[PDB]
Design a protein around this ligand. Sequence first.
Ligand code: NA
Length: 426
Amino acid sequence: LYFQGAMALEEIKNGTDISTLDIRKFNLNINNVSVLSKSQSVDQFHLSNPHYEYLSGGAYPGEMENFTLKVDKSKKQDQVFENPLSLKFTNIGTVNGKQVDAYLNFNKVTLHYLNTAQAESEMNSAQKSTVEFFSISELWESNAFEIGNVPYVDANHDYIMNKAFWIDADVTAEIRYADGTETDLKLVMKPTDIDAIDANNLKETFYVKNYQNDVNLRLMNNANVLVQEEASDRTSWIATQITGGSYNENNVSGLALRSNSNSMNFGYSSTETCSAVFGLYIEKIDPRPVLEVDPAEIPAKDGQDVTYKATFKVPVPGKDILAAPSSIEMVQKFDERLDYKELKVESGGVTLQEGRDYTIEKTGQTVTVKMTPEYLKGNSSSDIIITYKTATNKKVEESEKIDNTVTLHVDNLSAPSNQVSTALLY
Ligand code: NA
């Protein structure tokens, strides 16, 4: 059942329109990327309005940072490039008041020799020297990077081989709070347009390593026609049909993945000539919970009432978050100098009931409200308001202020409220 899957990977296929999600796409571009390290195998260069695939090919407007791999032209056989490229995107957004950075590490890129005349010919030509694997641009989508073996070229960079090798890129993306605090963000990727199949039946493939342990939720639209291949070390999604237009690229040949963590070790393998475009995302809990405290200041002494009111906005399934919540919890932790007394929970002008609508777990100063499966089934959209009654205790006079924050949990997602404080007088 939907509400008793603790730990279990949750896979969903439903009518949600993946092309119209309202999730947050992080800012990733040629202007906030830096190369933390790259091996000498990597040929990196800037292009402006590059040509697609061939020099005589169409030219597309935009700045791009392009990355290729120098191959050993004598080895007409698979070539492996360990850790060729490690990237940081500095300040991809502000979330919950904190700067977030992205890390993108190419763990390995393997070039699989195509064993054709065309491949041998590129290998033997004196003008070709590198193979395409990665680029950063907004030619296709905003805030995106591109993995694939389709060359981008201009008059001075026409050395990239065509259809000599297909590529398999093993990549780890991670999002991280710059300030060093624990990153509670759950990375989301949304591969789309996984639809290329070449003359030789190679198929465009997106994959996730350690899928079963690393992914929290996987969303498909009813129209999905990818083949999901579950193997020991990974799960892959394999092209089966051409798809055009954002709706089809998203729903027919696409999917959404929410990680168990701030990172995901994914992969991508091309055909003799294809590529895919990617952003990094998170779901939205916006607004954050709104926390209030009455009063703003008290006499520093035992038995003084302090009351917290927390207003929780519930994310909208299929817009802010990928799907209806399996669980919603609100976690409060009171300053040592406070004794918890009791709480009430309200929604839609009505006073919800402990037992029917929510339960309460207390462990020391930590008090958690858990909404029941019965409440969640009602798919209510209205704010949940929790009012916590506490009173100072005999420890108040031991920080000349008592601070409070409450945290909303939706599945494995969380968002902290604003912090409030009550001044201690004397
Ligand atoms: Na397509």
